[PDB]
């Protein structure tokens, strides 16, 4: 199920998550949260949990691009205070 994730954190706290190519059934060509930093804003929030497929972050559509590209998308907003993601649990 789709769900708009909202991770309110501070700069210098990237997010704390690991993404990979969606090799699953491929419902949506995106990335998969294969890992998460149990302590950062990712685990603190709770809205984000391993086994979810992230489509777009703050507008940055990932549904289509490779893994390296997606990684760049997130690592780019390493100084964000609110991560608005649209993933599917």
């Amino acid at each position: 199920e789709f769900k708009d994730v909202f991770i309110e954190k501070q700069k210098g706290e990237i997010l704390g998550v690991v993404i990979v190519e969606s090799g699953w059934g491929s419902i949506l060509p995106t990335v998969i949260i294969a890992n998460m930093m149990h302590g950062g804003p990712a685990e603190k929030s709770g809205k984000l949990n391993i086994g979810d497929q992230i489509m777009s972050i703050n507008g940055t559509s990932l549904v289509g691009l490779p893994l390296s590209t997606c990684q760049s998308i997130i690592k780019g907003l390493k100084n964000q205070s609110r991560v608005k993601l649209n993933i599917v649990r």
């Binding site: 998550v17 890992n35 997130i74």
Partner: peptide, 4 residues
């Protein structure tokens, strides 16, 4: 595995 490089965390974002």
């Amino acid at each position: 595995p490089v965390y974002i």
